[PDB]
Assembly symmetry: C2
Amino acid sequence: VDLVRTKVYNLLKEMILNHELKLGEKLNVRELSEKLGISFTPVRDALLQLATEGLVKVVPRVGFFVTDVDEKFIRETIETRIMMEVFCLENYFDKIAGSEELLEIKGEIDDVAASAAREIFDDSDERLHKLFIRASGNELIISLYEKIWDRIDLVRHLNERYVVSNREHKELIERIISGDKEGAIEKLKEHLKNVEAETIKNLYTYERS
Amino acid sequence: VDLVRTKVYNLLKEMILNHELKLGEKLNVRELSEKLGISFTPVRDALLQLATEGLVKVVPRVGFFVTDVDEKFIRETIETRIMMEVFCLENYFDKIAGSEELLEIKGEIDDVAASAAREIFDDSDERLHKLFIRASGNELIISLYEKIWDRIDLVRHLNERYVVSNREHKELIERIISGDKEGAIEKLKEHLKNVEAETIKNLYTYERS
Ligand code: NI
Ligand code: NI
């Protein structure tokens, strides 16, 4: 289920980022099905799920459309992350600082600063932000974030300054390892608000919206 | 859709609070359908939705069960509310303080302090906490809270100290109207953590869990 949604989602992201699909554009389910080798019903069901995260607009008896992602959609995405991630980092700080995972992410971060390989950025980016959430141990929280992860992920990709983001993550982690809880929190706010400003600026490079 | 889920949900709450249904108990869809005058499929679909909020456990090819609501389920519910509501109140404080709605809720609160009518408590309780969320103007946030509202509502009802909760709301609102933002925030944390401790204690009065 998550499995099909994730392939559907991944195709949709790939075609938005390639400018094959415009923001607001009507989706052709048959097309998606040809591309993915998945039958109609399962694709349809995935799209309904994505509509649930606000990625797809559903017009009954009409069809499915790619959301017309606009500034408000971005801002709301980021502000939602600030609320959740900051809440997790603040309250689960010791647990995050002490995790070995944080150290492996740090290693990826250092690789990006040298190589600038986007895939390693995406992996390290996801792991760091999700670590904050996961460290709560609060399965409701963690499932809320998971529920909107596809939206988070698409938004993540609508900017191009990943190397600067890489450096911001580095500094975050450094504050965290130093037990500078307050510094870390301010740095996370700063990083996300920075990402948000840059995304809003990049947005006109996408067809429509 | 929300319409059917809400009737299904309301019946389930009523029977849990009457101790007609135990926590963990297997649900009989036909029963629910007889009671509500709604057909099988729509009930089934509502139950699937409620399973989404973690109110119903789904066992495929077996059936649907009432969640075995335990301390962790309560704690996680409350901590999730603390994160969201505190984030909203802190960041949208002026907007909340200035709303006429807050004044009407205040009027209900004063009625409860005098009458102790549970329905007026529930109405005023819902409005106050939802005002914080709604004042964000962030439709993602507001939809996350709405998505788990049934869970919030059931949890709200698993304690019996609503008059004390009424007094805590009163003091909250008083802090808010006074522009004591920090006082208000601390009072909201305190209120929810208090509710949480009392609920955990009351919980053994419910069959199972
Ligand atoms: Ni980041
Ligand atoms: Ni309350």
